[PDB]
Design an enzyme around this catalytic site. Structure first.
Site, PDB file in Angstrom:
ATOM      1  N   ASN A   1      -0.635 -13.584  15.993  1.00 49.01           N
ATOM      2  CA  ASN A   1       0.344 -14.171  16.904  1.00 49.01           C
ATOM      3  C   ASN A   1       1.823 -14.002  16.554  1.00 49.01           C
ATOM      4  O   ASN A   1       2.251 -14.261  15.416  1.00 49.01           O
ATOM      5  CB  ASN A   1      -0.008 -15.643  17.113  1.00 49.01           C
ATOM      6  CG  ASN A   1       0.730 -16.256  18.271  1.00 49.01           C
ATOM      7  OD1 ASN A   1       1.800 -16.826  18.093  1.00 49.01           O
ATOM      8  ND2 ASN A   1       0.175 -16.129  19.467  1.00 49.01           N
TER       9      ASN A   1
ATOM     10  N   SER B   1       3.926 -16.340  23.800  1.00 44.24           N
ATOM     11  CA  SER B   1       3.678 -15.560  22.605  1.00 44.24           C
ATOM     12  C   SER B   1       2.612 -14.514  22.958  1.00 44.24           C
ATOM     13  O   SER B   1       1.932 -14.631  23.979  1.00 44.24           O
ATOM     14  CB  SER B   1       3.172 -16.475  21.487  1.00 44.24           C
ATOM     15  OG  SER B   1       1.873 -16.984  21.767  1.00 44.24           O
TER      16      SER B   1
END
Ligand SMILES: [Cl-]
Ligand SMILES: [Cl-]
Ligand code: NA
Length: 130
Positions: free
Chosen positions: A60, A51
């Site tokens: 995120n 990520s």
């Protein structure tokens, strides 16, 4: 864009961040400072889970924005992660508001716990006129 401290403080207040879901403006300032150094184009790839964290609040890609390359991710903010890299922080602020609407609140960012929680955060907003 790299914001100057008070410039950012005044901007966040205008966007309605002061007291949002019980979070004072000084806490948002402390968060942005430690997450990106008030830099809107900051990106951070997390090799461990594939990520990436985007922008001023280092949001995120696994849960909040879509970048297409993060496995088993969702887009709760309903935004392309590209939106969180603009100089104009309106989208980043709207998404941050979405993040704290979850039960963890501001605690969703581990950096806040390490560097802001239970500290004297007045310094981040002193002299800015907010
Ligand atoms: Cl978008
Ligand atoms: Cl998208
Ligand atoms: Na995503």
């Amino acid at each position: 864009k790299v914001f100057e401290r008070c410039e950012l403080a005044r901007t966040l207040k205008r966007l309605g961040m002061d007291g949002y879901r019980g979070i004072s403006l000084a806490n948002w300032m402390c968060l942005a400072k430690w997450e990106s150094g008030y830099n809107t184009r900051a990106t951070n790839y997390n090799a461990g889970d594939r990520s990436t964290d985007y922008g001023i609040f280092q949001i995120n890609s696994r849960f909040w924005c879509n970048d297409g390359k993060t496995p088993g991710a969702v887009n709760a903010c309903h935004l392309s992660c590209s939106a969180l890299l603009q100089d104009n922080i309106a989208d980043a602020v709207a998404c941050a508001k979405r993040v704290v609407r979850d039960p963890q609140g501001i605690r969703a960012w581990v950096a806040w716990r390490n560097r802001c929680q239970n500290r004297d955060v007045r310094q981040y907003v002193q002299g800015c006129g907010v």
